[PDB]
Amino acid sequence: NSNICEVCNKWGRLFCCDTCPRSFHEHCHIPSVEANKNPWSCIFCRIKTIQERCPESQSGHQESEVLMRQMLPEEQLKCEFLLLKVYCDSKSCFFASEPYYNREGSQGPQKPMWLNKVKTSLNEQMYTRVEGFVQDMRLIFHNHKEFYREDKFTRLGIQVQDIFEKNFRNIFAIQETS
Ligand SMILES: [Zn+2]
Ligand SMILES: [Zn+2]
Ligand SMILES: [Zn+2]
User: φ, ψ for residue 101 (rounded to 5)?
Assistant: First the structure.
Protein backbone atom coordinates (compact mmCIF):
# COMPACT_ATOMS: atom_id res chain seq x y z
CA ASN A 1 0.00 0.00 0.00
CA SER A 2 0.78 3.69 -0.31
CA ASN A 3 2.57 5.29 2.69
CA ILE A 4 0.68 8.60 2.36
CA CYS A 5 -3.06 9.45 2.66
CA GLU A 6 -4.74 9.52 -0.76
CA VAL A 7 -6.70 12.67 0.14
CA CYS A 8 -4.21 14.98 1.98
CA ASN A 9 -0.89 13.42 0.84
CA LYS A 10 0.46 13.28 4.43
CA TRP A 11 1.77 10.32 6.43
CA GLY A 12 0.35 9.46 9.84
CA ARG A 13 -2.10 6.89 11.28
CA LEU A 14 -3.16 5.32 7.93
CA PHE A 15 -5.81 2.65 7.19
CA CYS A 16 -5.02 0.57 4.17
CA CYS A 17 -7.47 -0.59 1.48
CA ASP A 18 -7.55 -4.39 0.99
CA THR A 19 -8.52 -4.27 -2.68
CA CYS A 20 -6.31 -1.44 -3.96
CA PRO A 21 -3.02 0.14 -2.79
CA ARG A 22 -4.60 3.38 -1.41
CA SER A 23 -4.38 4.47 2.15
CA PHE A 24 -6.29 6.97 4.30
CA HIS A 25 -6.43 8.92 7.48
CA GLU A 26 -9.54 7.93 9.43
CA HIS A 27 -11.45 11.20 8.83
CA CYS A 28 -9.93 11.94 5.42
CA HIS A 29 -11.87 8.92 4.00
CA ILE A 30 -15.60 9.57 3.48
CA PRO A 31 -17.40 7.97 5.12
CA SER A 32 -14.84 7.89 8.09
CA VAL A 33 -12.90 4.60 7.99
CA GLU A 34 -15.18 1.90 9.47
CA ALA A 35 -14.25 0.45 12.96
CA ASN A 36 -13.84 -3.24 12.17
CA LYS A 37 -14.47 -4.81 8.67
CA ASN A 38 -11.72 -7.24 7.52
CA PRO A 39 -11.26 -7.03 4.64
CA TRP A 40 -12.08 -3.31 4.09
CA SER A 41 -12.55 -1.73 0.74
CA CYS A 42 -12.17 2.07 0.27
CA ILE A 43 -14.65 4.31 -1.52
CA PHE A 44 -12.70 4.16 -4.79
CA CYS A 45 -13.11 0.38 -4.75
CA ARG A 46 -16.82 0.56 -3.79
CA ILE A 47 -17.53 2.96 -6.64
CA LYS A 48 -15.60 0.73 -9.10
CA THR A 49 -17.80 -2.22 -7.94
CA ILE A 50 -21.03 -0.32 -8.73
CA GLN A 51 -19.77 0.38 -12.22
CA GLU A 52 -18.74 -3.25 -12.78
CA ARG A 53 -22.02 -4.68 -11.53
CA CYS A 54 -23.96 -2.36 -13.88
CA PRO A 55 -21.86 -1.47 -16.93
CA GLU A 56 -24.82 0.43 -18.38
CA SER A 57 -24.48 2.91 -15.46
CA GLN A 58 -21.69 4.55 -17.47
CA SER A 59 -23.88 5.47 -20.42
CA GLY A 60 -24.54 9.21 -20.63
CA HIS A 61 -27.18 10.84 -18.47
CA GLN A 62 -28.99 14.16 -18.35
CA GLU A 63 -28.04 16.33 -15.34
CA SER A 64 -31.71 17.11 -14.71
CA GLU A 65 -32.44 13.40 -14.21
CA VAL A 66 -29.40 12.85 -12.01
CA LEU A 67 -30.34 15.74 -9.73
CA MET A 68 -33.88 14.39 -9.10
CA ARG A 69 -32.62 11.01 -7.93
CA GLN A 70 -33.50 10.09 -4.42
CA MET A 71 -30.53 9.54 -2.10
CA LEU A 72 -30.67 5.71 -1.95
CA PRO A 73 -27.41 3.94 -0.86
CA GLU A 74 -25.70 4.08 -4.24
CA GLU A 75 -26.42 7.82 -4.76
CA GLN A 76 -25.33 8.52 -1.13
CA LEU A 77 -22.03 6.80 -1.91
CA LYS A 78 -21.60 8.67 -5.19
CA CYS A 79 -22.05 12.05 -3.40
CA GLU A 80 -19.61 10.99 -0.63
CA PHE A 81 -17.05 10.13 -3.33
CA LEU A 82 -17.60 13.43 -5.17
CA LEU A 83 -17.12 15.34 -1.90
CA LEU A 84 -13.92 13.34 -1.29
CA LYS A 85 -12.56 14.20 -4.76
CA VAL A 86 -12.92 17.87 -3.89
CA TYR A 87 -11.04 17.39 -0.60
CA CYS A 88 -8.32 15.66 -2.62
CA ASP A 89 -7.34 19.07 -4.11
CA SER A 90 -5.20 21.11 -1.77
CA LYS A 91 -7.15 24.29 -2.64
CA SER A 92 -10.15 22.78 -0.79
CA CYS A 93 -8.54 24.15 2.41
CA PHE A 94 -10.11 27.52 1.57
CA PHE A 95 -13.59 26.10 1.53
CA ALA A 96 -13.43 23.48 4.30
CA SER A 97 -14.25 25.37 7.46
CA GLU A 98 -16.85 28.02 8.30
CA PRO A 99 -16.04 31.30 6.53
CA TYR A 100 -16.51 34.86 7.79
CA TYR A 101 -17.03 38.02 5.83
CA ASN A 102 -15.58 41.45 6.66
CA ARG A 103 -14.24 43.17 3.55
CA GLU A 104 -14.64 46.82 2.60
CA GLY A 105 -17.16 47.10 -0.19
CA SER A 106 -18.67 43.62 0.08
CA GLN A 107 -21.46 42.08 2.05
CA GLY A 108 -21.37 38.42 3.11
CA PRO A 109 -23.69 35.86 1.53
CA GLN A 110 -27.19 35.25 2.72
CA LYS A 111 -26.55 31.48 3.07
CA PRO A 112 -22.97 30.66 3.95
CA MET A 113 -21.78 27.18 3.04
CA TRP A 114 -18.61 25.12 3.45
CA LEU A 115 -17.27 21.63 2.86
CA ASN A 116 -17.33 20.38 6.41
CA LYS A 117 -21.02 21.43 6.68
CA VAL A 118 -21.77 19.36 3.54
CA LYS A 119 -19.79 16.49 5.05
CA THR A 120 -21.85 16.61 8.29
CA SER A 121 -25.06 16.90 6.25
CA LEU A 122 -24.22 13.76 4.29
CA ASN A 123 -23.27 11.89 7.46
CA GLU A 124 -26.55 12.84 9.13
CA GLN A 125 -28.58 11.78 5.94
CA MET A 126 -29.98 15.31 5.59
CA TYR A 127 -30.18 15.23 1.78
CA THR A 128 -33.17 13.41 0.23
CA ARG A 129 -32.13 13.97 -3.41
CA VAL A 130 -28.83 14.40 -5.23
CA GLU A 131 -30.01 17.97 -6.04
CA GLY A 132 -29.68 18.97 -2.31
CA PHE A 133 -26.06 17.99 -2.19
CA VAL A 134 -25.17 19.51 -5.56
CA GLN A 135 -26.96 22.83 -4.73
CA ASP A 136 -24.95 23.22 -1.48
CA MET A 137 -21.67 22.36 -3.27
CA ARG A 138 -22.29 24.88 -6.03
CA LEU A 139 -23.36 27.53 -3.45
CA ILE A 140 -19.90 27.28 -1.84
CA PHE A 141 -18.26 28.54 -5.04
CA HIS A 142 -20.98 31.01 -6.01
CA ASN A 143 -20.81 32.72 -2.58
CA HIS A 144 -17.02 33.04 -2.97
CA LYS A 145 -17.22 34.55 -6.46
CA GLU A 146 -19.80 37.05 -5.39
CA PHE A 147 -17.96 38.13 -2.18
CA TYR A 148 -14.44 38.52 -3.67
CA ARG A 149 -15.75 40.49 -6.73
CA GLU A 150 -12.64 41.64 -8.67
CA ASP A 151 -10.04 40.46 -6.19
CA LYS A 152 -7.86 37.88 -7.91
CA PHE A 153 -8.72 35.55 -4.99
CA THR A 154 -12.00 34.91 -6.82
CA ARG A 155 -10.05 32.52 -8.96
CA LEU A 156 -9.73 29.97 -6.20
CA GLY A 157 -13.51 29.52 -6.39
CA ILE A 158 -13.36 28.96 -10.15
CA GLN A 159 -10.55 26.45 -9.71
CA VAL A 160 -12.21 24.32 -7.04
CA GLN A 161 -15.62 24.53 -8.80
CA ASP A 162 -13.95 23.16 -11.92
CA ILE A 163 -12.66 20.15 -9.88
CA PHE A 164 -16.17 19.65 -8.53
CA GLU A 165 -17.87 19.85 -11.94
CA LYS A 166 -15.41 17.54 -13.78
CA ASN A 167 -15.77 14.96 -11.02
CA PHE A 168 -19.61 15.34 -11.01
CA ARG A 169 -19.73 14.66 -14.75
CA ASN A 170 -17.43 11.58 -14.31
CA ILE A 171 -19.03 10.01 -11.24
CA PHE A 172 -22.62 10.48 -12.40
CA ALA A 173 -21.79 9.72 -16.08
CA ILE A 174 -23.23 12.92 -17.44
CA GLN A 175 -23.61 12.87 -21.24
CA GLU A 176 -20.66 14.50 -22.95
CA THR A 177 -21.37 17.71 -24.89
CA SER A 178 -19.64 20.70 -26.59
ZN1 LIG B 1 -5.32 12.49 5.09
ZN1 LIG C 1 -9.43 0.68 -2.55
ZN1 LIG D 1 -26.89 -4.44 -14.79
Answer: -130, 100
3-state DSSP assignment of residue 24: strand
Q: Which ligand has its closest atom nearest to the C-alpha of 1?
A: 2
Rounded to the nearest angstrom, the distance between the alpha carbon of 92 and the centre of ligand 3 is 35
Cβ-based neighbours of 33, under 8 Å, separated by 6 or more? 15, 24, 25, 26, 40
Give the ligand whose atoms come closest to the C-alpha of residue 53.
Answer: 3
Per the entry, the structure determination technique was: X-ray
User: Assign residue 9 a region: left if phi > 0, alpha if psi is -120 to 50, beta otherwise?
Assistant: left
How far is the centre of ligand 1, averaged over its atoms, from the C-alpha of 4 (Å)? 8
Strands (E), the chain: 14-16, 23-25
Query: According to CATH, what is the number of the domain 1-59?
Result: 3.30.40.10
Residue 54 alpha carbon to ligand 3 centre in Å: 4
Would you state the torsion angle of the CA atoms of residues 132, 108, 168, 124, taken in this order, to the nearest 10 degrees? Answer: -40
Contact 163, 86 (CB under 8 A): yes
Smallest-distance ligand from the CA of 54: 3
CATH number of 60-178: 1.20.920.10
